[PDB]
Amino acid sequence: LVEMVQALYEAPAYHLILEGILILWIIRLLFSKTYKLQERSDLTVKEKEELIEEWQPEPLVPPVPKDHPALNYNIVSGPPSHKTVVNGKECINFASFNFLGLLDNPRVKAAALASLKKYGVGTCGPRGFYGTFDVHLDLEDRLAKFMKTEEAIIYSYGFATIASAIPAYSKRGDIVFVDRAACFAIQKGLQASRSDIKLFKHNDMADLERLLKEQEIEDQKNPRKARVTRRFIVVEGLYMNTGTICPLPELVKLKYKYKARIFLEESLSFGVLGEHGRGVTEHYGINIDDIDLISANMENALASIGGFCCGRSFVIDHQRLSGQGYCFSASLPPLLAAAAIEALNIMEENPGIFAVLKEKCGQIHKALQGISGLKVVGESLSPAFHLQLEESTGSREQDVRLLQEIVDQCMNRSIALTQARYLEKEEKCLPPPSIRVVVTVEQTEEELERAASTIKEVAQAVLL
């Protein structure tokens, strides 16, 4: 003990160093349980050749059954608009997402031709260098002013917008609470970012509350990690797969109570909802600042290619350097930018088109009630809703075949409908097959009740 310590202290230095080295050797030996066998073997050249020969690759593409419903593409013999011509038959368009009828306005075409005379068709470069035109900055300023927000950023492709916006902010090790009935663009954006994804029930705040409280428990488990994880809630203003609106005020309250930012998608909502057509926020009266990021695409309402994101500069400015679809691709052609600017001018000039669209949506949604085999899933304010089989059959393929028979019999009677298309093996929550009905400010009253009557008669004829 003490005497041993004194004796060790009285002993020389190099001897004690050697004894310490031996002690370290012993402590290394005790924990060295790796029972290495000390053997090395390698393959021969002929064995490598035979292994090469035996391997057989699968074909690049699997054979197709050739009976795919999507194998036959509808061929439009002209512009897709009111009174279109599809498959050689005269029809009335009930499938194109053109809510405001801005596709065929002479003013929009005049603006597009004016910008075509000046710049041409192609930008020929990314926005990062010699691909930024004055029209791009003008359009971004117009989008910022229209939505009463500081900054906006435009992408040249609608799908890439949210799919590049989401990975820019959400990184590995974060938590995202996304709705179950989220569009495919949001799903691929959430796949690109390697964050942890938690899905809650469609338009249910109870499941969101439960998930948030479980996250709170996990935060209390380890505060240090909980201090470096960011929480996001990704929702859509008007869901495409269902046609139902989102409960914004409760989401805002949950955000401020549980410290999780909000990403909002307004693709259908952007140009149809609100007194001036600004989205679900104007419909509910929620302040614009309560939502961090609002994504949209100019393809549906504005009738032009591309998309955009809107928000405060603190949030938007990061996408100019982290958005892959923005950094590594050519910019939007000036033609489509000018078309979007003119569409914005027309939308600002007359705000009654949103009111007449709401009128027509309500009328057609009320009229389509009372079909034996068809149920109208959706809401009375969305321009696009669905028609689903009430008593579904045993298989999905028979259901899509029945719906396609209904669609064909409708087209033969000058009603142009379409059926919702999904990737069966890729969609997270595959929706049931459903016919899609889209309402415009161009469809007259008589056409509305005629389409309702035609769909009713065809449904009764087919499903009985």
Partner 1 sequence: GLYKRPFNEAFEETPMLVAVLTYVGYGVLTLFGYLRDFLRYWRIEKCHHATEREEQKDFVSLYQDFENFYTRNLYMRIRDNWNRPICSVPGARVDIMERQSHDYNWSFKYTGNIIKGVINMGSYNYLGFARNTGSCQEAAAKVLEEYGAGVCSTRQEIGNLDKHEELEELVARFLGVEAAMAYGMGFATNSMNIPALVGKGCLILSDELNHASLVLGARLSGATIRIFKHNNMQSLEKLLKDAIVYGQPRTRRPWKKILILVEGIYSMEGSIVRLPEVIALKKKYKAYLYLDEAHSIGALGPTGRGVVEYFGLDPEDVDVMMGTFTKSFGASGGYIGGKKELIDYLRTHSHSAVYATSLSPPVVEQIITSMKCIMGQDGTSLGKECVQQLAENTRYFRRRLKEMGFIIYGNEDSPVVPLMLYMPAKIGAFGREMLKRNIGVVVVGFPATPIIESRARFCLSAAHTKEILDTALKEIDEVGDLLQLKYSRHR
Partner 2 sequence: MNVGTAHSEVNPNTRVMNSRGIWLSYVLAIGLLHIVLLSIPFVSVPVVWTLTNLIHNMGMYIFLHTVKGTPFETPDQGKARLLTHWEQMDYGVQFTASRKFLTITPIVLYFLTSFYTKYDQIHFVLNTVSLMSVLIPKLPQLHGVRIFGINKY
Q: Does 327 bind partner 2 (CB under 8 A)?
A: yes
Among 14, 35, 55, 73, interactor with its own copies by CB under 8 A = 14
Report the candidate in 223, 274, 229, 226 with the shortest Cα–Cα distance to residue 248.
274
Distance separating alpha carbons of residues 342 and 216, to the nearest angstrom: 48
Considering just the CA atoms, what is the radius of gyration of the chain in Å?
30
Q: Does 17 bind its own copies (CB under 8 A)?
A: yes
Residue pair 327/126 in contact by the 8 Å Cβ criterion = yes
Report the candidate in 63, 120, 10, 98 with the shortest Cα–Cα distance to residue 384.
98
Nearer to partner 1, 120 or 370 (CB): 120
For the segment 13-32, give every residue that binds partner 2 (CB under 8 A).
15, 18-19, 22, 25-26, 29-30, 32
Among 110, 113, 137, 321, interactor with partner 2 by CB under 8 A = 321
Residue pair 355/443 in contact by the 8 Å Cβ criterion = no
For the segment 143-202, give every residue that binds partner 2 (CB under 8 A).
167, 171-173, 193-195
For the segment 131-150, give every residue that binds partner 1 (CB under 8 A).
131-134, 137
Q: Does 225 bind partner 2 (CB under 8 A)?
A: yes
CA dihedral over 285, 288, 327, 423, signed as positive or negative: negative
CB of 434 to partner 1, least distance (A): 12
CB of 42 to its own copies, least distance (A): 16
Residue 342: which H helix or E strand, with range? helix 334-349
Among 6, 20, 122, 348, interactor with partner 1 by CB under 8 A = 122
Instruction: Output the six-digit token pair for 269.
Output: 């909502």
Q: Does 26 bind its own copies (CB under 8 A)?
A: no
How far from the centroid of its chain's Cα atoms is residue 52's Cα? 43
Distance separating alpha carbons of residues 176 and 195, to the nearest angstrom: 7
Q: Does 63 bind partner 1 (CB under 8 A)?
A: yes
Using the CB atoms, write b or e for 93-127: b if 16+ within 10 Å: bbbbbbbbbbbebeebeebbeebeeebeeebeebb
Binding region for its own copies (CB under 8 A) out of 16-24, 181-189, 346-354, 412-420: 16-24
Nearer to its own copies, 16 or 430 (CB): 16
The CA–CA distances, whole Å, from 345 to 72, 147, 211, 445 equal: 39, 13, 43, 27
Report the candidate in 350, 278, 280, 270 with the shortest Cα–Cα distance to residue 302.
270
Distance separating alpha carbons of residues 82 and 97, to the nearest angstrom: 11
The CA–CA distances, whole Å, from 280 to 182, 269, 321, 462 equal: 16, 6, 29, 38
Residue 221: which H helix or E strand, with range? helix 205-221
Residue pair 246/280 in contact by the 8 Å Cβ criterion = yes
Residue 267 CB burial class (10 angstroms; 0-12, 13-18, ≥19): buried
Instruction: Output the six-digit token pair for 11.
Output: 């002993």
Nearer to partner 1, 203 or 418 (CB): 418
Binding region for partner 2 (CB under 8 A) out of 106-114, 323-331, 337-345, 392-400: 323-331
Binding region for its own copies (CB under 8 A) out of 12-20, 65-73, 185-193, 414-422: 12-20
Q: Does 221 bind partner 2 (CB under 8 A)?
A: no
Q: Does 183 bind partner 1 (CB under 8 A)?
A: yes
Report the candidate in 258, 230, 216 with the shortest Cα–Cα distance to residue 166.
230
Q: Does 414 bind partner 1 (CB under 8 A)?
A: no
CB of 43 to its own copies, least distance (A): 20
Among 2, 5, 12, 54, interactor with partner 2 by CB under 8 A = 12
Q: Is 97 helix (H, G, I), strand (E, B) or coil?
A: coil
Residue 374: which H helix or E strand, with range? strand 374-375
Among 303, 344, 406, 439, interactor with partner 1 by CB under 8 A = 303
For the segment 11-40, give every residue that binds partner 1 (CB under 8 A).
none
CB of 28 to partner 2, least distance (A): 11
Nearer to its own copies, 25 or 130 (CB): 25
Among 8, 11, 15, 48, interactor with partner 1 by CB under 8 A = 48
Nearer to its own copies, 13 or 64 (CB): 13
For the segment 434-463, give every residue that binds partner 1 (CB under 8 A).
436
Binding region for its own copies (CB under 8 A) out of 14-22, 127-135, 245-253, 313-321: 14-22
For residue 396, the partner it binds in partner 1, its own copies, partner 2, none, with Cβ less than 5 to 8 A by kind, is none
Report the candidate in 349, 341, 276 with the shortest Cα–Cα distance to residue 308.
341
Instruction: Output the six-digit token pair for 449.
Output: 């009740």
Which residue bears the tokens 């435009």?
154
Q: Report how many residues bind its own copies under the rule CB under 8 A.
A: 6
For residue 325, the partner it binds in partner 1, partner 2, its own copies, none, with Cβ less than 5 to 8 A by kind, is partner 1
Task: Annotate each residue in 241-270 with x if it binds partner 1 (CB under 8 A) or - if it does not, as one string.
Answer: ---------------x--x-x---------
Q: Write out the residues near partner 2 by the rule CB under 8 A.
A: 7, 11-12, 15, 18-19, 22, 25-26, 29-30, 32-38, 128, 167, 171-173, 193-195, 224-225, 227-228, 321-322, 324, 327-328
Contacts with its own copies by CB under 8 A lie at 12-14, 17-18, 21
